[model samples]
Target chain A: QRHVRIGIIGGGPAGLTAGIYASRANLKTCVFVGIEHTSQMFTTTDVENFPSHTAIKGPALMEAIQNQAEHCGAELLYEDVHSIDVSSRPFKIVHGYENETTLADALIIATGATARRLDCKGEKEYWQKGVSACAVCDSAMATGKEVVVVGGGDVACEEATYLTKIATKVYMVLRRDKFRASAAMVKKVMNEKLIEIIYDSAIDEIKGDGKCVTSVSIKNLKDGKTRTLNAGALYWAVGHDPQTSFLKKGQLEQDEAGYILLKDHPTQRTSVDGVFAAGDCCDHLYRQAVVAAGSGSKAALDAERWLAM
Target chain B: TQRHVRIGIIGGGPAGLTAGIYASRANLKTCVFVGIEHTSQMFTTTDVENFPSHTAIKGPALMEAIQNQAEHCGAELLYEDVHSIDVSSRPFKIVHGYENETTLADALIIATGATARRLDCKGEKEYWQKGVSACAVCDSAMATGKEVVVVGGGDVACEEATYLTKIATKVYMVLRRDKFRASAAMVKKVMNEKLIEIIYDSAIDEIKGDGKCVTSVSIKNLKDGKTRTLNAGALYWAVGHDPQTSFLKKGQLEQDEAGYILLKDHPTQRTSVDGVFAAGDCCDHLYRQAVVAAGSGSKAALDAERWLAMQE
Candidate 1:
């Protein structure tokens, strides 16, 4: 097996950013964009607040970064990381069935996280237009419009409060009469004038008028009363799934939510030796593109320093 | 008093904005205070690259995303300059200069930054960024084969002058004092370099230019009151940096002799205060660069989130 200086899994912004910084430091780096190419940002339509672009199509931005990383002498591998034998000094990254395995002195995991999706009707059709899983990503688009936030806990109430910045009104639909969220969250939601809490409510169907989402058909659990709340957007703040499935057998430390727990401050070093994680995969806290890219750079630098030693 | 802020951010910049995005998505109500003037020194930067998402964008354009991301996640932003802080407090007290501007929150991050000191001599402003620079690592490549001068008598000045020898045709060291304060090893390296010239007991009287870039520097001998002019393409003000920590003047917060805020812990962005925290250049003397600042911002946000949750 050929020895690579650094091996990176996932060619999304985090991975590519790490590759760019590593290659610039004269490290022999190879990044696998994986079988899916650029990751979830590809499915995203308009990304406005990526720190650099006022607004840009997600795919176009990721493609540009890929080109820049390639030009910097970092090799790109179009394969997926199926498993890793990181029990020794030279970690072996096994690609999915039939693909070749590569050995790296250091590794950076930039595998971006994925947003959980609800299989409710019209969910797929109005994605990015009227239905979004991220309140921070889509709140600006729903400015001065009515939005429906589905969830009973802190995340749901938090999303409702976030919508108040631009949205004219927000309808928070809960499955039970009482809020499952913490007291601070419940207090914040109750205080917001524009947020109307629909207790004992559950969404039966999401209705969109083809051009964009128009309203949500909500069912009252107690009285069985059904009402169509006028909404231009539906935001889901239920939860998220991190892309750390490959490390199920590894000794890597993950939080209750399965997100990789990163080492504190300055470095993107992970709990696992010789393994560093950057971007959304390890970060359950701050998930902005710039932050991910920044962390990715740190991870690459950490990997390069490790290889040098 | 509240126990902790869902997420506490120190400096308001691109990295902080990105952190706000992730934290808010995880359903954390982040609170960030971009200094009275947000975006750090990047706001003055004309162009930016390597920030990933935006290929090449204006500094202001990038700052907007950071602000928007924070707001999108229910992150509250306060435009105030944080003065002294008490981190040991359960809910930290972030003291500010102006009355009624002080705040208390859980989890603290230090992102206040330092500014590269300028010479502030005559014609300095006219040639700023045109031919006079503070960072050799950031601008040495642009001055290739040109005559450059580093003004100071310290380790940084000698080190920077030596670095310029690789890119500039001739490197001039203008020292206001007779003896250098730099270590003997560094001084020896500068003196031995064939391309470097040391001018003792002289200081730059004025920077002369042709209304576009630097043409020459007018120096005055402090002891003899004599003057001389040398042709140069650029001048690097290697005096040092003034970290933005004037707000912590008294013993309220711990700081170094140079006024750099001492971080309470290693690799963590916490200050002496419980809810208070720090990140970026303000709390860093080594590796005071943009990338490091951004990384610190990410750490601050994450730490803030956990601390806020712990309070409950």
Candidate 2:
């Protein structure tokens, strides 16, 4: 068993940024990146709003950050960590087929979160092609085109408003009759000229032109009427699923939505001793990359302080 | 007066640049001003070790990255200083240097930072960051086995003097007055150290440099006008700090006597003003590091997002 000061899971912005801050403090830091190498940002086509870069491809930005972490002397393991057992001091991490047990003074859990999607057909075929979840990303392409947004929450309402900026018309397909969004958001959505509300509606089937999304077949549950609407894009504003399966019941607390509940008072630290959480996985609101990275930096500093103590 | 921007950042640093990269992806209009020069202080030095991406990078290069991140985000640059603000207004006006040229902001952030006070001694100007620094912990590793001088007579200065003994070959303490301003234990420790030497009734006259970096420091005795030069590789400035809030309205906006902006008191980043918020070094007195500043900046953005939603 090799002893390390800190062990971080995930090689994304949060993990890398933490590694940079911690490793500079001379802490023996090791980072485990999943098989994907980079995080979700790698799949992104363009990265313009992160704060600094005028424009960077998703892959390019990941590479720069990866290089930065490496430059800081933070060791990187290009392996997937399946499970982590924090029952003992200097924790245990199981990766791939081998259980690489390492003792770490502290741990930072930055596995991050993933966008939830309906397990329906055509979603996989046109994931980013015409069917996307990020309205901030695809709203420009939806301009002058009709798009259907699924969900009835704040994300849904916000996405609808975002799409209204570019799309000629936006149809919000809500499964419930009303919305779960704040009254103001609901009012704003109702006032938008390009937006229409479809109550008791859900996406039944999406018909596309094989290469790109063309239209969607939606059904109104209240009135047994099925209609096909012209939808050049289908935006999923459903929800985000936090990747915290490895964290079992007793180890840490979870929110109502199954997301890992972060501990308050030294806020970045998690309930588990010597373990910390940051970025989208723990952040229910403000899931922007900059916020996640900042959380990562905080987690690193927290971990450093914990180790110092 | 309300307007929309593709991206708006509160702080200008590594995290800001990183955020700018992602924000610019959609090619939305973006803007980042020098919210705080706190991080910029690192530029006065030649070497930085802890920034993850670079083993050692000049502060200017990091600053360039901050600039590049905004440009990548499609964010325009502004040097507008902020004074008092009305976050409740439909369009927020971050009034300062540009009085009537008030910015109509769909989103706003506060990234103003604090500045560390300097000793203003002999070679201090020439040796700052070259062989002089404010933070002992941030630079101790680079000064191992080197002779260094610590200026100031306070607790922080004494602590640095003690910490310097661990890494430096010799630690010299320079005080303007005779007595120490620190606690008894700290003062006693410094007075008893073999590796540490304390000089009283003296102030540094000139900071001597070796062309590129600091070499020696010349001190003048206030009592006898006698001058002595000490051979040292580094000089640590540990006086104190004054938050760069001169352009701000102190009474209206809550601030400490030294002028650090007071945050919402909670972990929240809200200021006393409805929409106005403070982040980074502006409000934080402890842990004035880049990571902390960046984290606070992120909080400011989140607060702004929620505030913007409220206005809707």
Per-model C-alpha lDDT, please?
A: 0.73, 0.71
lDDT (Cα, tens digit) per residue for candidate 2, span A20-94:
888877888988877743487765665545543445677777787788788788888888887777878778777
Per-prediction TM-score of chain B? 0.76, 0.63
lDDT of 2 by residue, B41-121 (tens): 556667765443345567787678667665644566666545555555655655544443455666555565666665556
- Which residue runs does candidate 1 get wrong by more than 4 Å? A176-180, A190-193, A199-201, A220-225, B1-49, B53-111, B116-242, B251-279, B284-312
Question: How well does candidate 1 score on lDDT at residue A59?
Answer: 90
Instruction: Give interface RMSD for all predictions.
Output: 5.8, 4.4
User: Across residues B190-272, which tens digit of lDDT does each residue of candidate 1 receive?
Assistant: 88899988899998899998888788989999998988998888888887666677756466567765677777776566666
